Amino acid sequence: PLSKTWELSLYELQRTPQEAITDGLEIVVSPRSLHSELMCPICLDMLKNTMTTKECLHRFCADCIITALRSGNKECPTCRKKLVSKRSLRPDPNFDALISKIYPSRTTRIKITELNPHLMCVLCGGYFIDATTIIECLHSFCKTCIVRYLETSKYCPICDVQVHKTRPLLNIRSDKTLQDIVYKLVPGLFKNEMKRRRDFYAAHPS
Numbered sequence: 001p002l003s004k005t006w007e008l009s010l011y012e013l014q015r016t017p018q019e020a021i022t023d024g025l026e027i028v029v030s031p032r033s034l035h036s037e038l039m040c041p042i043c044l045d046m047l048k049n050t051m052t053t054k055e056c057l058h059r060f061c062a063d064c065i066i067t068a069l070r071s072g073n074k075e076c077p078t079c080r081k082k083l084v085s086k087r088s089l090r091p092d093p094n095f096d097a098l099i100s101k102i103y104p105s106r107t108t109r110i111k112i113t114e115l116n117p118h119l120m121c122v123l124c125g126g127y128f129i130d131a132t133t134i135i136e137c138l139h140s141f142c143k144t145c146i147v148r149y150l151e152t153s154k155y156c157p158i159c160d161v162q163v164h165k166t167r168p169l170l171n172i173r174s175d176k177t178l179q180d181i182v183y184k185l186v187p188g189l190f191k192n193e194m195k196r197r198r199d200f201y202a203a204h205p206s
């Protein structure tokens, strides 16, 4: 049920932000390879005018997925969930902005401060951890941050559009693709977060 899906763990109830790297670090971008999270799975090029399925948060070039639906096959090409029409998609300017910085229409080093705005939760001011996306407007937050926020508001923290008339948790989804590209881009973030969890569970055994 919904109550179990978004119940926060003992760790999650006390978690604190993963603070941004602001020291001048540059990350390495390889020539002639893509991060697969930034690749359209239909045309196999970097995403162009990214559109994202509301139900399953899968990304495609706008033209690729609109054309795919005109085959008559009304499903998501990535997971095969039903996809009624292009109104089941939303524009993803965050992915577009990330791509424009990592793959400038082609440098080998990128300042992580240039990427940070696209990888950070505005509620805690740190990097996304268990990124979770409001499906109507495609704004994203840490799981714990948005779950706690929606206990006292039914409106998006960023754009203020009502998430749901009565139960906002119905209209959020875990965003694996966003969290995966965050962990791939931010050095040490996955390692640091898993260490925090291990340290917590060791201090609170059961």
Ligand SMILES: [Zn+2]
Residues within 6 Å of the ligand: 040, 041, 042, 043, 044, 045, 047, 048, 060, 061, 064
């Ligand atoms: Zn494409």
Ligand SMILES: [Zn+2]
Residues within 6 Å of the ligand: 053, 056, 057, 058, 076, 077, 078, 079, 080, 081
């Ligand atoms: Zn899908």
Ligand SMILES: [Zn+2]
Residues within 6 Å of the ligand: 121, 122, 123, 124, 125, 126, 127, 128, 129, 141, 142, 145
């Ligand atoms: Zn957060």
Ligand SMILES: [Zn+2]
Residues within 6 Å of the ligand: 134, 137, 138, 139, 156, 157, 158, 159, 160, 161
């Ligand atoms: Zn929003």
